[PDB]
Write a structure and sequence with these properties.
This is part of a larger assembly, with 7 copies of chain A.
Chain A: H1 2-5, E1 13-20, E2 27-30, H2 41-44, E3 56-60, H3 67-72, E4 78-81, E5 93-94, E6 96-104, H4 119-123, E7 133-139, E8 154-156, E9 175-176, E10 190-191, E11 194-196, E12 210-218, E13 226-227, E14 240-245, E15 248-256, E16 267-269, E17 275-279, E18 286-290, E19 295-301, E20 311-315, E21 324-326, E22 330-333, E23 346-349, E24 352-356, E25 359-360
Parallel strand pairs in A: 2-14
Antiparallel strand pairs in A: 1-19, 3-6, 4-7, 5-13, 6-12, 7-12, 8-11, 9-10, 14-15, 15-18, 16-17, 17-18, 19-20, 20-22, 21-22, 23-24, 24-25
The complex binds a molecule of 2 linked components (NAG-NAG) (2 copies) and 2-acetamido-2-deoxy-beta-D-glucopyranose (7 copies).
Chain lengths: 361, 99, 251, 120, 49, 50, 99
């Protein structure tokens, strides 16, 4: 009170000095059931992968993507991102994801990179310089390789011009190594562009087949259908907690509600358009949001010439949420309630007054 | 309409509080009226500007509310002083003042 | 497969009064015993809505979507099955298809080749609404929404790339025109489509026993930006509304 | 509850203190207004049990014993006919005490004339 | 008459409604003041000729 | 920077002038009451109770 | 505060910038007063075989405070699996050299 009044002597009376706040104890985030998962099982772990000249593009949209399972898998030998962070994939949202799946040689795994020049980069799969997303690669010697030689995986070796980003070329035009005219007939200097790999189990690291899946993100004006996973925690009631229900956040006490919502309604508002009722997304139940017991802290004291005893009034605050007496004005701490009636000396409110004789109310 | 003066005072106070509360839903030129959305969607260098816009708008709303409350308080104080004069002169005695 | 229908009878389109229909819930927020003023795309009260018949009448034209579409259906025997949404209605652009067949409702956003005269046919054994489907971006299968006995109200909106479908089923016994009353439309489904739509077309079903059109009637109204004052009762349903721009009393 | 907002709000100084102090002044002014209007007597007078006033009837303005609120029928009718950091402080005088003050004033003006306003 | 200005002004809320309400209150208050001062009789008295 | 200081100080000064005018109205009402008491209690005998 | 950075990173040595060296190498406060000086040093700070003496913190758990220096040569754990001070799968050195 001396600090508030900027004086070392306080006259007799009641002085509003502070503002009591019920501090939030827990954070409760309730988000609905994590269903309609993105089909990453059929892209990373498909039966047969595609070649690099005809890489399979799968569009991931209208689903929630759990990048934590993909990132925490230890089978992947390469997880390099060029426009985002690996630890922030579960937090960000994107419009759609393009998954480019192919198989390449072990030495060419580095060639799927922005600014990198190689045969795969120039003629098979090209990335832009401002590429966003992540490249994932893993060894597939146990599955793709065959003892007789796996010739199913072809790759383009020659083309007149370099590829544009995200461009496929499945054409089988005969390349002209020299300047001789070739009308589709092979010759001394005219060869077929697609050559087969030599994947065999006896080769060491560098010639083994590596399966590469490249995820590219789009952030166009379309709605962000693709989002990270939502970790819903448990629901705690009857306490002043920070609630985050389906993106609507705030602080309040969540109690049981007798209000019967219609099935399409999620939140509830009073006359003043403040959210006082809500529906839990996990379990379809209605909860009232009572605001936390904020109040004004007033100090009731006589003159410092007389005594240094003080009483604290928490305005509009119940005594269970803070010589403790409950009044309609609020909770009064430090004053002994008496049944006698005297004249009002220091006004408290709701017919309650305080006086010094100790401090009585 | 017998008790219109008291109902007018109650309605004016309720409407004033309502207008104050509804001023929180206005962004005042910022991207959003919610501080949490600004803090979650933007970095602190631009969130500081947006929060500053919300702060000045809400502060102007609160000053407007306090000013009109003070003017209404002066009017109610004048009416209460008149009521105290009527209590002293009409109830506690007989008044020769016409009307 | 496409078939030209060349047995139509020429008749001018009809018009009728909207009365106090077309109100929908602006949001997913419960409100109890309170009056809420909202500014949104709403259908004007007592407006002039275009009336189309199916009786030899087979009304399936293409109309401009504008900012929203209010579809009223005085329906018996489930002739009306779906809608056609798009800009050019061909393979050049991307179009939205809403269909309700005998089992479920399918919502697709794809590059379809629409027929000039798309229809279904009734046992349902005739589907002639498209010839090709090249590039699909969005598919959504849901639960089926569905004297004239049924009244079906729908509101379609394209706001911020979101397609809002509001709907209401009403049991009526009026023979010809729209009944006079109040029924607020619940929000049914929000679609993340993110595409341009400027034109629409109703999809009907033929009856085979040439072809015969079952008895049905529908109404098209257009959504305009305006303010409504909605009344919410104790149970939280909208029981009455006021159009702020209709007459000075409601203003 | 935003800490960044409060940190930015501290740049504007003691505006919040002025708003709180002005509202506190209004709040104490309302109690002072009620005190000036109704608390004009320091003796709580009561009417006699026998309402023999020479034919004059004051039942509609005297407090009703049947009602728990101890209000007059006219006062009961008057009370029936009147229907984010925000707090509403209760008035210093409750409705029961204001009714008690009006009852004391009515008892004084009925039993004692204008003498109670000028002395004993 | 700028529609863009009105669109930006709607972001500030109901300030305009408050100002119009206050001015309307003052305007009716002036008529109430004149009514209170001068209209204290309900009969129009006339002097003798 | 000067513009930010000007708008803040101008808002503070307008607020101070506003409460000064309200307090001036209150003091003017009290002074009018005091003038009425001087005219009716000191310069004459008043039959008004209290 | 003296350091050597890239040509495109000179915009990130400023108050209120979002960037990589801004977050994990050198952070300026929002209320920073002073001057940033940048000049080209290709003639002195470059070698034909590659000058790798200048290193930046590629990996860190959190963004730095203003006027905070991190010289700790501890390994970074990028995944769920602990690294135990040894490089391996999802275990990378935080300091990488400019070429
Ligand atoms: C049904 O009638 C329409 C209207 O004429 C036909 O659409 C035209 O078909 C021809 C066929 O080559 C095209 O050249 C025209 O460009 C089409 N018109 C438009 C506006 O695109 C439609 O083909 C007919 N259906 C069938 C099955 O023949
Ligand atoms: C004073 O007035 C009251 C009310 O006018 C009288 O109470 C009425 O008494 C009659 C007959 O006893 C009843 O039929 C009415 O219903 C009463 N009205 C009410 C409102 O109570 C009362 O009798 C009068 N006289 C005295 C001495 O109190
Ligand atoms: C195959 O990959 C998918 C990717 O989501 C994963 O969920 C699945 O568990 C994997 N299967 C095996 C046998 O590793
Ligand atoms: C979601 O999960 C909860 C888990 O308790 C389950 O009870 C509920 O039926 C699920 N579905 C919906 C629509 O809430
Ligand atoms: C509706 O429009 C038609 C033609 O556009 C017109 O003939 C009719 O009178 C209109 N109805 C009303 C009620 O305005
Ligand atoms: C939508 O399409 C119409 C015509 O089909 C065109 O005039 C309009 O510009 C388009 N709008 C957008 C945002 O593409
Ligand atoms: C309804 O449409 C869906 C989607 O094409 C299809 O799978 C289903 O078989 C159809 N049902 C009937 C009865 O034709
Ligand atoms: C759309 O389809 C055509 C042919 O059906 C194809 O050439 C084109 O690449 C497709 N575009 C997209 C974006 O899928
Ligand atoms: C509200 O619901 C109750 C059932 O709880 C019902 O008795 C009452 O009639 C309903 N009122 C309205 C106006 O719908």
């Amino acid at each position: 009170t001396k600090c508030t009044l900027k004086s070392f002597t306080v006259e007799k009376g009641i002085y509003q000095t502070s503002n009591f706040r019920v501090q939030p104890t827990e954070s409760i985030v309730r988000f609905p059931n994590i269903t309609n998962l993105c089909p990453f099982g059929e892209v990373f772990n498909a039966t047969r992968f595609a070649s690099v000249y005809a890489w399979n593009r799968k569009r991931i949209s209208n689903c929630v993507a759990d990048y934590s399972v993909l990132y925490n898998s230890a089978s992947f030998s390469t997880f390099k991102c060029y426009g985002v962070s690996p630890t922030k994939l579960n937090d960000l949202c994107f419009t759609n994801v393009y998954a480019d799946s192919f198989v390449i040689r072990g030495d060419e795994v580095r060639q799927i990179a922005p600014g990198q020049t190689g045969k795969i980069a120039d003629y098979n799969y090209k990335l832009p310089d401002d590429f966003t997303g992540c490249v994932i690669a893993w060894n597939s010697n146990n599955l793709d390789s065959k003892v007789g030689g796996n010739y199913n995986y072809l790759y383009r070796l020659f083309r007149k011009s370099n590829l544009k980003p995200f461009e496929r070329d499945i054409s089988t035009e005969i390349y002209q190594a020299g300047s001789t005219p070739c009308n589709g007939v092979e010759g001394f200097n005219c060869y077929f562009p697609l050559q087969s790999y030599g994947f065999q189990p006896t080769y060491g690291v560098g010639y083994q087949p590596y399966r590469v899946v490249v995820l590219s993100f789009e952030l166009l004006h379309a709605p962000a259908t693709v989002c990270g996973p939502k970790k819903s925690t448990n629901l705690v009631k009857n306490k002043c907690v920070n609630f985050n229900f389906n993106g609507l956040t705030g602080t309040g006490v969540l109690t049981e509600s007798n209000k019967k919502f219609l099935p399409f309604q999620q939140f509830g508002r009073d006359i003043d358009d403040t959210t006082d009722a809500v529906r839990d997304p996990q379990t379809l139940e209605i909860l009232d949001i009572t605001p936390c017991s904020f109040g004004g802290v007033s100090v009731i004291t006589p003159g410092t010439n007389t005594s240094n005893q003080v009483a604290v009034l928490y305005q509009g605050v119940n005594c269970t949420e803070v010589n403790v007496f409950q009044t309609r004005a609020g909770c009064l701490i430090g004053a002994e309630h008496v049944n006698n009636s005297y004249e009002c000396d220091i006004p408290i409110g709701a017919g309650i007054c305080a006086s010094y004789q100790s401090i009585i109310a | 309409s017998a008790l219109g003066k008291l109902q007018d005072v109650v309605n004016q106070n309720a409407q004033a509080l309502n207008t104050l509360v509804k001023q929180l839903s206005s962004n005042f030129g910022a991207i959003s009226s919610v501080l949490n959305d600004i803090l979650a969607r933007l970095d602190p260098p631009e969130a500081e500007v947006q929060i500053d816009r919300l702060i000045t708008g809400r502060l102007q709303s609160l000053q407007t509310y306090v000013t009109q409350q003070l003017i209404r308080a002066a009017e109610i104080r004048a009416s209460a002083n008149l009521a105290a004069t009527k209590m002293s002169e009409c109830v506690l005695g007989q008044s020769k003042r016409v009307d | 497969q496409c078939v030209n229908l060349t047995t139509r009878t020429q008749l001018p389109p009809a018009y009728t009064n909207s009365f106090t229909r077309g109100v929908y819930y602006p949001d997913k927020v419960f409100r109890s015993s309170v009056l809420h003023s909202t500014q949104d795309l709403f259908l004007p009260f007592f407006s002039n809505v275009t009336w189309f018949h199916a009786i030899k009448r087979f009304d399936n034209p293409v109309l401009p979507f504008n900012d929203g579409v209010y579809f009223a259906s005085t329906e018996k025997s489930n002739i009306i099955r779906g809608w056609i949404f798009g800009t050019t209605l061909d393979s050049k652009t991307q179009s939205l298809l809403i269909v309700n067949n005998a089992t479920n409702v399918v919502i697709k956003v794809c590059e379809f080749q629409f027929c000039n005269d798309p229809f279904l046919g009734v046992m349902e054994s005739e589907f002639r609404v498209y010839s090709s489907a090249n590039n699909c971006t969005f598919e959504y299968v849901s639960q089926p929404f569905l004297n004239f006995k049924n009244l079906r109200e729908f509101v379609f909106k394209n706001i911020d790339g979101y397609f809002k479908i509001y709907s209401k089923h009403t049991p009526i016994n009026l023979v010809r025109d729209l009944p006079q009353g109040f029924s607020a439309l619940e929000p049914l489904v929000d679609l993340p489509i993110g595409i341009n739509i400027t034109r629409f077309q109703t999809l009907l079903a033929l009856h085979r026993s040439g072809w015969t059109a079952g008895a049905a009637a529908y109404y098209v109204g257009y959504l305009q930006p305006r303010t409504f004052l909605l009344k919410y009762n104790e149970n939280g349903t909208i029981t009455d509304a006021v159009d702020c721009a209709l007459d000075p009393l409601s203003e | 509850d935003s800490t960044e907002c409060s940190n930015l709000l501290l740049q504007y100084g003691s505006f919040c203190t002025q708003l709180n102090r002005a509202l506190t002044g209004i709040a104490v002014e309302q109690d002072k207004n009620t005190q000036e209007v109704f608390a004009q007597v320091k003796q709580i007078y009561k009417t006699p049990p026998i309402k023999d006033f020479g034919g004059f009837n004051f039942s509609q303005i005297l407090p009703d014993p049947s009602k728990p609120s101890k209000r007059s029928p006219i006062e009961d009718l008057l009370f029936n006919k009147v229907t984010n950091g925000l707090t509403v402080l209760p008035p210093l005088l409750t409705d029961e005490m204001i009714a008690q003050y009006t009852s004391a004033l009515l008892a004084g003006t009925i039993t004692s004339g204008w003498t109670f306003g000028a002395g004993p």
